[PDB]
């Protein structure tokens, strides 16, 4: 849609309000660890076929090597992404984070100890010849234990847990650090904390609908 900025040599535009928008980004991280056997795929139950195959040398000593290196790497991909924090952090039993609501992202004990949103992602997305599928080293219960450590560490400590010893700080105060890092003074958050908490909570809620409404999101 066309737009032309009312640009002059003495006119400046300055915002007076704001919105706290929460967007979603989806990234593939791993594949299925599939291995395929030479003898069973090519000459399944045939001694005569198997003997002639040996004339080709080690064509499929390579293939079992190539398909394994993929599989041992698919487990590294998952390890680099999630396995970044050492101590498994936890949220306090209380939930008075200055008025911010994380129930939709934090694990809930009413279930697979996943969260509200993680379950929407998991619900949505759904042999005779040596096709052996290996199991991932980190089962999905361990992976969701890892993203709770990152979620719980962020909420209580901020960015101080990926840089050294985890130092706690109130979530109302931590957002003043985050606000102060984008050129907006601290007092903008404190004076409007009640409005901001509602904007953060409302935007999170739309995430579940946006995934629940259209199935093409994932």
């Amino acid at each position: 849609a066309e737009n032309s900025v009312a640009y002059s040599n003495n006119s400046i535009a300055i915002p007076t309000n704001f919105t706290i928008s929460v967007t979603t980004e989806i990234l593939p991280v791993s594949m299925t660890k599939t291995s395929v056997d030479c003898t069973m795929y090519i000459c399944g139950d045939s001694t005569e076929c198997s003997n002639l195959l040996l004339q080709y040398g080690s064509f499929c000593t390579q293939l079992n090597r190539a398909l394994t290196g993929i599989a041992v790497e698919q487990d590294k991909n998952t390890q680099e992404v999630f396995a970044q924090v050492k101590q498994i952090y936890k949220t306090p039993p209380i939930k008075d984070f200055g008025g911010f609501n994380f129930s939709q992202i934090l694990p809930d004990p009413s279930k697979s100890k996943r969260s509200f949103i993680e379950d929407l992602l998991f619900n949505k997305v759904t042999k005779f010849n040596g096709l052996t599928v290996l199991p991932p080293l980190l089962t999905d219960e361990m992976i969701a234990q890892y993203t709770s450590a990152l979620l719980a560490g962020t909420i209580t400590s901020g960015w101080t847990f990926g840089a050294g010893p985890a130092l706690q700080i109130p979530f109302p105060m931590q957002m003043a650090y985050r606000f102060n890092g984008i050129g907006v003074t601290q007092n903008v958050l404190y004076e409007n904390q009640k409005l901001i908490a509602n904007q953060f909570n409302s935007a999170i809620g739309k995430i579940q609908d946006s995934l629940s409404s259209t199935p093409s999101a994932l």
């Binding site: 002639l52 004339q55 080709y56 040398g57 080690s58 064509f59 000593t61 390579q62 190539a66 970044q84 960015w159 101080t160 990926g162 840089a163 050294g164 010893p165 130092l167 700080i169 109130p170 109302p172 105060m173 003043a176 003074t185 601290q186 007092n187 404190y190």
Partner: protein, 147 residues
């Protein structure tokens, strides 16, 4: 083990390329002169065809795995070129890019077919609990810390 793994992968791929010369590919003999002397040119041509086609694929496979592997090294030479522009030739503010901590500086060290970065980082230690306050009121006005 990162630079050594590169060396082993290349050598194994080359050794597999050589050892494929000792394969019949459905021919009588793996030696070129033996199949030439044993049979007549009208028949040796078929046995010659079986070997060369077998040796074309063995050479074709090696180059393809080289093109895939060389693109895995170019993605590491672009990262090391980026970790030197941003970690060494300037101080970084990207988390965990130049080591785990708060980045201070880095020093490159060469290595065979590689490079080693020594990421000097500042790590906080000896935390102490305190009691915080968003602001303080003194004369009916709210005071916020500058930094």
């Amino acid at each position: 083990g990162k630079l050594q793994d590169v060396v082993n992968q290349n050598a194994q791929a080359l050794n597999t390329l050589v050892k494929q010369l000792s394969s019949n590919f459905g021919a009588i003999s793996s030696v070129l002169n033996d199949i030439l002397s044993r049979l007549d040119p009208p028949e040796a041509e078929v046995q010659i065809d079986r070997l060369i086609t077998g040796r074309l694929q063995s050479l074709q496979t090696y180059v393809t795995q080289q093109l895939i592997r060389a693109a895995e090294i170019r993605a590491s030479a672009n990262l090391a070129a980026t970790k030197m522009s941003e970690c060494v030739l300037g101080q970084s503010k990207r988390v965990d890019f130049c080591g785990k901590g708060y980045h201070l500086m880095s020093f490159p060290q060469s290595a065979p077919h590689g490079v080693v970065f020594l990421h000097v980082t500042y790590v906080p230690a000896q935390e102490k609990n305190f009691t915080t306050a968003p602001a303080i009121c003194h004369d009916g006005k709210a005071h916020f810390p500058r930094e």
